[PDB]
Design a protein around this ligand. Sequence first.
Ligand SMILES: CCCCCCCC/C=C\CCCCCCCC(=O)OC[C@H](O)CO
Ligand SMILES: CCCCCCCC/C=C\CCCCCCCC(=O)OC[C@H](O)CO
Ligand SMILES: CCCCCCCC/C=C\CCCCCCCC(=O)OC[C@H](O)CO
Ligand SMILES: *C/C=C(C)/C=C/C=C(C)/C=C/C1=C(C)CCCC1(C)C
Ligand SMILES: *C/C=C(C)/C=C/C=C(C)/C=C/C1=C(C)CCCC1(C)C
Lengths: 229, 229
Amino acid sequence: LGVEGEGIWLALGTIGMLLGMLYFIADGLDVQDPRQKEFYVITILIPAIAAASYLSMFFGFGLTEVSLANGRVVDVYWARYADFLFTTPLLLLDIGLLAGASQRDIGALVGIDAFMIVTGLVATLTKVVVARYAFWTISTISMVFLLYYLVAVFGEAVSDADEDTRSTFNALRNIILVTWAIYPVAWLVGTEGLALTGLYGETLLFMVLDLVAKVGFGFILLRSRAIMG
Amino acid sequence: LGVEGEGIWLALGTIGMLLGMLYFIADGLDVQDPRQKEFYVITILIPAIAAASYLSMFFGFGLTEVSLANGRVVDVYWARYADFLFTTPLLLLDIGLLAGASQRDIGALVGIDAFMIVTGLVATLTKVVVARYAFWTISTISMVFLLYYLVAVFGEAVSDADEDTRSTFNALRNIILVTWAIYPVAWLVGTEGLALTGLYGETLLFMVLDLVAKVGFGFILLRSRAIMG
Ligand SMILES: CCCCCCCC/C=C\CCCCCCCC(=O)OC[C@H](O)CO
Ligand SMILES: CCCCCCCC/C=C\CCCCCCCC(=O)OC[C@H](O)CO
Ligand SMILES: CCCCCCCC/C=C\CCCCCCCC(=O)OC[C@H](O)CO
Ligand SMILES: *C/C=C(C)/C=C/C=C(C)/C=C/C1=C(C)CCCC1(C)C
Ligand SMILES: *C/C=C(C)/C=C/C=C(C)/C=C/C1=C(C)CCCC1(C)C
């Protein structure tokens, strides 16, 4: 299933996201506190979007071909990018609200994030080889500014909170730092880049990163005392 | 010895380089073949430059302080970068000549290498924290292009040679791939970056990488039948 058997990872991704979503829905039933309810809506939406993306890729809706200037043809799962465009801002929104960061601060970070994702999409769609890597590079650079500001700006914002909140912040921050940094690598090593691995390994890698960065993150956030329970 | 005891590694580094150099000088006494003599000159120079660098660091000549924008002070062994500027191109020259790569091909790679090292130095010197990581990233990116071209371009160039040469090429190539890739990590984790380890462990790690990448590499190259023609 798929082009070279990567269907299994799409199915598992769909399953992981679907069940992560339902779990988050279930745990949010009791909640009436408006702030806590916002956290829930955000964190439910993240795996929902990802579920829809995974589901569509599994059936082949989010897949296209790109002929490069050097003749090589790349299978591009563009739905991934549609996923990223929406879920990563929500993720920043989630940790922002937890951090007590200002609307200005969150917006700024969402901007950089959008640049990151879109530049990535541009990199993936470009048929000129050097340009692919130039876009990928620009994107990776902007990811660094993003991660830096997450640490410095969101970190500053949370610093007046109690030890429990700051501790949850650091844990989520660390999930972002580690897993987000691997995304550009996955692209570099997979079929969109150097093609050191095929579609099968690339999809597996994205699936793990996706599950950790969304379901795992969501889990840590919703079970924290910081969101009031 | 040093800021926190790392003097021992500087001494050992100096010693390793010095004796690797002398070993290479000794083995080169017999050689008259002009090609083989070039390999010798290049490979002797590498540990000589590194010896000088280690020696100067040991006495404290290659050490400076950098106040960051956030107040933190970094002890920077800048001599390391002066070392890298000269030795890494010579290393590329060494494997290039063995590979039968054209002068244009070697030049191109030396260019990327110089970009790598200088961007690294810039990363290490910058007082603006974001910029540190952005430069580190750009450097690491260019290292990837370097290693890619080493594998693809030098690999192509050697492909018409006999199995013995190709085999020596792969071994040297593999030493570069493995050990060079650790350098940015050492920086990331050490006092110049996240500071998860201190000067003592950083210096030890640099020392091992340096000894393998220079003395070990040199040894493998000079004892090969490939250079003896
Ligand atoms: C280039 C040629 C391609 C051929 C065209 C075939 C049509 C594909 C359509 C949909 C599946 C992929 C879209 C799924 C996107 C991820 C989920 C998502 O974004 O869901 C909506 C979201 O809630 C909004 O904010
Ligand atoms: C193989 C292809 C290469 C792919 C390229 C991936 C590079 C992205 C990784 C890390 C960037 C660092 C961003 C994190 C910024 C650190 C913020 C900071 O200030 O950290 C210091 C800390 O305060 C003191 O411990
Ligand atoms: C492959 C190479 C690996 C070799 C690695 C060698 C590690 C150093 C060994 C022993 C002394 C450190 C043990 C003590 C713990 C460090 C902090 C400390 O208090 O050090 C006291 C020091 O001996 C001042 O009196
Ligand atoms: C649930 C999805 C998550 C957490 C996605 C994160 C995605 C990225 C951080 C993507 C980064 C990329 C680059 C920095 C370079 C170009 C390719 C990208 C888009 C994969
Ligand atoms: C004898 C010394 C050798 C072979 C050194 C090689 C050095 C590198 C490949 C260094 C790479 C770095 C980065 C990719 C970014 C951070 C700073 C550097 C310069 C350590």
